[PDB]
Structure 1
Amino acid sequence: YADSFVIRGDEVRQIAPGQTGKIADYNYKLPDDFTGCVIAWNSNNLDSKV
């Protein structure tokens, strides 16, 4: 399965098994025996607009 979304820059540390915070609490929660991989890259020029 591939899940996709957009978050802040310093919220990428809550996408991991066993974390807390406004993102992992109630936006997107990863089980505690996760198996896959997590990939993330900056996208300032595409998503941020004056």
Structure 2
Amino acid sequence: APGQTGKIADYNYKLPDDFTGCVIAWNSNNLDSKVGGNYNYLYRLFRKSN
């Protein structure tokens, strides 16, 4: 959300406060949640610079 802080926010994908768009998300259990446990997805929590 514009200006919100967090590991996803500042390290993964930041968003300007003047952002003009839509955020559309839906649970992807039927697609991504599988017996493999979909661990391929990664976030960059630790980083020198936000």
TM-score of the superposed pair, with normalisation by structure 1: 0.63
Unaligned runs of 5+ in 1: 1-15
Aligned-pair Cα RMSD in Å:
0.7
Higher helix share: 1
Among all aligned residue pairs of Structure 1 and Structure 2, give the percentage whose two residues are the same amino acid: 100
Moved over 4 A (4+): none
Match in the other structure for 1:19: 4
Count of aligned residue pairs for this structure pair: 35
Match in the other structure for 1:8: none
Q: Distance in 1 between matches of 2:18 and 2:3?
A: 9
TM-score of the superposed pair, with normalisation by structure 2: 0.63
